[PDB]
Amino acid sequence: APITAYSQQTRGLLGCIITSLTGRDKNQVDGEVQVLSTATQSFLATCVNGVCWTVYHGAGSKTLAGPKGPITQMYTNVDQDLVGWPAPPGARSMTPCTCGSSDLYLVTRHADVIPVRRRGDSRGSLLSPRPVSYLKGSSGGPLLCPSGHVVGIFRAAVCTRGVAKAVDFIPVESM
């Protein structure tokens, strides 16, 4: 892996339950990728062109807690499994890839960067298999080309007997 990543936690359970109910987040936002949580799930959002994108099966139609109260989705597409909120200011916006590289890198919730071989518009194989438990909570995270540009957003693991051999992703064109 060429690209590197680290994470910073910003809230714990209590602030989270309360921030969900107020919809008001005063924390400073930073980073390309936001770690997100709702009552029942945990997932990621990738910032691209000033929009925070994530999976619909995680966010559904919910607002995002922001510094002025709840942020309404700017984009909701149930069939592509894709939603986007205007990025809070502070988020570092990435830029869509284009170059057509097929050496790809998935950023996970634990800030690991793993090598993916692009196989189709919305599919990739992992060069080494991983438990699927290791991928849980990373839906919405970025698939990057070697230059650090975004080709897509992770949607679903292709797996058997709890091991993931490939990933389904939403191509940056859909965005």
């Binding site: 690209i3 590197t4 990543a5 680290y6 994470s7 910073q8 936690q9 910003t10 809230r11 714990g12 989270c16 921030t19 969900s20 109910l21 107020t22 919809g23 987040d25 924390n27 936002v29 930073d30 980073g31 390309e32 990728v33 936001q34 770690v35 997100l36 949580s37 709702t38 009552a39 990621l44 966010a59 919910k62 607002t63 995002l64 807690a65 709840p70 809070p88 570092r92 990435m94 950023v107 919730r109 800030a111 995270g141 650090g148």
Partner: peptide, 12 residues
């Protein structure tokens, strides 16, 4: 309930 930002990944 709103979705909440509980952390962030810093890319480099």
């Amino acid at each position: 309930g709103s979705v909440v930002i509980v952390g962030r990944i810093i890319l480099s």
